[PDB]
């Protein structure tokens, strides 16, 4: 009875975008909590868990994410960057350019 690595300063999940993925992570790896800097590989996640995770990202966010992105961004704070681009993909690219050029 000793697993994972020693914590000193756990970092709570961010609002609804970050906590959304974080909630599912501990259920997949059967872990305690998920910190924004905790790496899936240190926590107990392995390649097969990344495969199922992608499948959840697909239904949770209604987008098409690839497993490579999940491994490339092994933490909550990094993963959101992929959701940002993937979410925009469901919106129309023609009307998007009109909003884009008008942004701050």
């Amino acid at each position: 009875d000793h697993s994972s690595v020693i914590t000193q300063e756990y970092a709570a999940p961010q609002g609804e975008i970050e906590e959304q993925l974080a909630d599912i992570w501990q259920t997949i790896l059967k872990i305690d909590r998920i910190g924004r800097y905790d790496n899936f590989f240190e926590l107990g996640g392995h390649s097969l868990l990344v495969l199922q995770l992608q499948s959840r990202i697909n239904e949770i966010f209604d987008v098409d994410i690839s497993i490579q992105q999940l491994f490339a961004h092994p933490s909550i704070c990094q993963l959101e960057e992929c959701i940002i681009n993937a979410q925009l993909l469901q919106f129309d690219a023609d009307s998007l350019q009109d909003i884009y050029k008008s942004m701050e």
């Binding site: 925009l88 469901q90 129309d92 023609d94 998007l96 909003i99 884009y100 701050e104």
Partner: protein, 31 residues
């Protein structure tokens, strides 16, 4: 104007336009 345009811009701009887009519902989905 195509999907690669949005993936060519950096995250700072990516989330900026995404917010305006979601707020304006130009082609958003409520499914």
């Amino acid at each position: 104007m195509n999907n690669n345009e949005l993936t060519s811009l950096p995250l700072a701009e990516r989330k900026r336009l995404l917010e305006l887009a979601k707020a304006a519902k130009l082609s958003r989905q409520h499914y």
